[PDB]
Design a protein around this ligand. Structure first.
Ligand SMILES: C[S@@+](CC[C@H](N)C(=O)[O-])C[C@H]1O[C@@H](n2cnc3c(N)ncnc32)[C@H](O)[C@@H]1O
Ligand code: SF4
Ligand SMILES: [Cl-]
Ligand SMILES: [Cl-]
Ligand SMILES: [Cl-]
Ligand SMILES: [K+]
Length: 245
């Protein structure tokens, strides 16, 4: 059996529509986003060990709210795709129970082994984070190159995998016009992208950086204005996709 390392899990009402979402926050991430609100999910060797049998015992206690529309399970974190084999086994069990599965991933896929296709086969929705198309900024914002994520995005389109693009709009980092145009061009021909979702930056989770004795880099940075959000949205809409925030 495959052993998963999780930070925590939680049941919570879906953003819209009835029913609940059972989210498992997997432990471990290899990106270093300055704005991470789950800083305590980076350590790959931390968290708690669980099995798929352990996880399904919590899932089934919410079964009557997960057949409801928008309900199901979501693998988040942290980066769930670092533990693709476990998430594949977990989703495989949810498909046996008629459960909708969602993968909340940064797309930092470094190796294309068969476990990736196997995971995607039992994944209904992929929420992919494109943090910055400008790789010069991306390195300063995330600590790594966006090449792996951009290649993974193209892989999802080739496989016609349902994808929601998530763009965290941070003032001074990803609120400029050029970066928005680059995002619109890159995702224009991806028919599998149902919509692009602009997430405004928030300072939630700053205490997690302080608990680990590390300075929060984005001190003083405020959430984007409603005008900036509308401006980026209007730019992205010029490339055909449904854009909402
Ligand atoms: C913490 S992540 C886990 C999924 C995966 N690690 C990722 O980042 O794509 C869940 C979502 O919260 C977003 N997020 C993280 N920090 C944020 C912040 N300070 N403000 C707004 N959104 C944030 C992430 O970009 C991602 O869309
Ligand atoms: S990818 Fe997600 S979990 Fe990893 S550092 Fe960035 S915001 Fe945090
Ligand atoms: Cl959390
Ligand atoms: Cl390796
Ligand atoms: Cl590839
Ligand atoms: K995501």
């Amino acid at each position: 059996e495959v052993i998963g390392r999780i930070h925590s899990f939680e049941s919570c009402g879906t953003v819209d529509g009835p029913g609940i979402r059972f989210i498992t926050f997997f432990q471990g991430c290899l990106m270093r986003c300055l704005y991470c609100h789950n800083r305590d999910t980076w350590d790959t060797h931390g968290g708690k060990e669980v099995t798929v049998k352990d996880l399904m015992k919590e899932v089934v206690t919410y079964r009557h709210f997960m057949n409801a529309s928008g309900g199901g399970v979501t693998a988040s974190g942290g980066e769930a795709i670092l533990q693709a084999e476990f998430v594949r086994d977990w989703f495989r069990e949810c498909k046996k129970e008629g459960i909708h599965t969602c993968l909340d991933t940064n797309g930092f896929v470094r190796h294309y082994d068969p476990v990736i296709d196997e995971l995607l086969e039992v994944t209904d929705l992929v929420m992919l984070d494109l943090k910055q198309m400008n790789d010069e900024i991306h390195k300063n914002l995330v600590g790594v190159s966006n090449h792996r994520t951009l290649r993974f995005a193209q892989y999802l389109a080739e496989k016609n995998v349902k994808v929601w693009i998530r763009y965290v709009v941070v003032p001074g980092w990803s609120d400029d016009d050029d970066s928005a145009h680059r995002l619109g061009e890159f995702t224009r021909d991806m028919g599998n992208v149902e919509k692009i979702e602009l997430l405004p930056y928030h300072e939630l989770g700053k205490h997690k950086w302080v608990a680990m004795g590390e300075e929060y880099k984005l001190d003083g940075v405020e959430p984007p204005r409603a005008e900036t959000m509308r401006r980026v949205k209007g730019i992205l809409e010029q490339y055909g996709h449904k854009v909402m925030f």
